[PDB]
Design a protein around this ligand. Structure first.
Ligand SMILES: CCCCCCCCCCCCCCCCCC(=O)SCCNC(=O)CCNC(=O)[C@H](O)C(C)(C)COP(=O)(O)OP(=O)(O)OC[C@H]1O[C@@H](n2cnc3c(N)ncnc32)[C@H](O)[C@@H]1OP(=O)(O)O
Ligand SMILES: CCCCCCCC/C=C\CCCCCCCCOC(=O)[C@H](O)CO
Ligand SMILES: [Zn+2]
Ligand SMILES: [Zn+2]
Length: 322
């Protein structure tokens, strides 16, 4: 059925394929390459600095990880890219601040790539085309120029819903000072001042390592979740169910389900099963900050499993009622 007719720019289009001849060579962006290397070097140095950190520093890092995660999953992903539920201003203010902490480009840019990632999955119009391998879909696409198909096909996507949202456009306008404050400055000064953590530890652990972990956990949804796992809902696509990815990406590891039903607010068959994001949204709904949560019916899901499933769903039947 059509449970979300307000938006259809994330529906997979099997019609579009790569038929423009041999693909052009990759064009390296050395500025991004250098910065990405230095970031992971600093993050690695943070790991060996963890045992010398205070308890609050480690706890603050986890808190900042989880909050930033919600900014991507509950906000950039399920809310603004897919429109799977409606959030009121206080929650949207939280999510837009949380998203800014995560530093994965502004919401508008994030959703524009993501809608293209769903419509033209596994093609040259897919920003993280998994056909190019693990490395490209993981981080490689952030180091090279986008394929012309991304710009052309993606440019035909409707983004007017995000253009008309004042909060989204507000973040885009002031994204540079925002990301500097929320992703680098504040999470470094807070441990430095509040519980007397050293500046070195706060910089490499509470900022560099944390941000590095958020990135790679997110990137695993593009790489690992497109290569390893089962496909209980649709075997014809490359999206996979990955439990480990769900743990790291607070519930975004059920990727086979999600690509099959991009309009589901839980991004999974079961709501709270290894899905902290859905649990968060449901809590917000209890407070009256969120509503119009769209869940695919059991009948539709069960019928799709019969039609295009790989047969691995038999082991996950009747886990929960919801
Ligand atoms: C724990 C949390 C777990 C969360 C799990 C959530 C899972 C969700 C599902 C998986 C998705 C997750 C993916 C998100 C992760 C990636 C985010 C980051 O890492 S970012 C990390 C930090 N951020 C970074 O590191 C940034 C690094 N990236 C870059 O520097 C560049 O983007 C580039 C070098 C990669 C491409 O360079 P280049 O080829 O020169 O292309 P340009 O970009 O410069 O575009 C210029 C023009 O092209 C046009 N156009 C482009 N795209 C589209 C489109 N999709 N459509 C239409 N048009 C498009 C447009 O006109 C644009 O103009 P304008 O918008 O300016 O007006
Ligand atoms: C207590 C001692 C800690 C020592 C290390 C501190 C490192 C500080 C730096 C970054 C924090 C990383 C936290 C990642 C949590 C991911 C599981 C998140 O998973 C979940 O919340 C659900 O399982 C997902 O559905
Ligand atoms: Zn995907
Ligand atoms: Zn999605």
């Amino acid at each position: 059925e059509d449970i979300r007719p307000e938006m259809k720019e994330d529906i997979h289009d099997p019609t579009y394929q790569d038929e423009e001849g041999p693909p052009p060579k990759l064009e390296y962006v050395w500025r991004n390459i250098i910065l990405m290397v230095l970031l992971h070097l600093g993050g690695l140095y943070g790991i060996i600095l963890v045992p010398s950190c205070k308890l609050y520093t480690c706890l603050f890092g986890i808190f900042y990880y989880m909050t930033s995660a919600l900014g991507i999953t509950a906000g950039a992903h399920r809310l603004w890219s897919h429109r799977t539920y409606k959030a009121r201003l206080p929650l949207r203010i939280f999510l837009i601040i949380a998203n800014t902490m995560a530093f994965q480009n502004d919401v508008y840019e994030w959703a524009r790539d993501h809608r293209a990632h769903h419509k033209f999955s596994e093609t040259h119009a897919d920003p993280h085309n998994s056909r190019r391998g693990f490395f490209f879909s993981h981080v490689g696409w952030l180091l090279v120029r986008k394929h012309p198909a991304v710009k052309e096909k993606g440019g035909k996507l409707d983004m007017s819903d995000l253009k008309a949202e004042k909060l989204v456009m507000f973040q885009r306008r002031y994204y540079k000072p925002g990301l500097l404050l929320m992703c680098f400055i504040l999470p470094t000064l807070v441990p430095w001042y509040c519980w007397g953590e050293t500046f070195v530890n706060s910089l490499f652990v509470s900022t560099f390592l944390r941000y590095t972990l958020v990135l790679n956990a997110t990137w695993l949804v593009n790489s690992a979740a497109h290569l390893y796992g089962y496909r209980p809902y649709d075997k014809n696509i490359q999206s996979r169910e990955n439990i480990l990815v769900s743990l790291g990406a607070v519930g975004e590891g059920f990727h086979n389900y999600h690509h099959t039903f991009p309009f589901d607010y839980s991004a999974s068959e079961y709501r709270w099963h290894i899905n902290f994001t859905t649990f968060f949204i449901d809590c917000m709904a209890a407070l009256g900050l969120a509503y119009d949560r769209k869940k695919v019916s059991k009948a539709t899901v069960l019928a799709r499993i019969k039609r295009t499933g790989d047969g691995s769903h038999k082991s996950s039947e009747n886990l929960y009622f919801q």
